[PDB]
Amino acid sequence: LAACLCCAL
Amino acid sequence: LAACLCCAL
Numbered sequence: 001l002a003a004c005l006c007c008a009l
Numbered sequence: 010l011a012a013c014l015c016c017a018l
Contacts, residue, residue, distance in 0.1 A: 005017050009010065 009014060
């Protein structure tokens with residue numbers, strides 16, 4: 001989840 | 010975008 005948020009941005 | 014990151018966290 002953390003990397004989803006980071007990479008989405 | 011800034012608030013998305015903040016609130017997601």
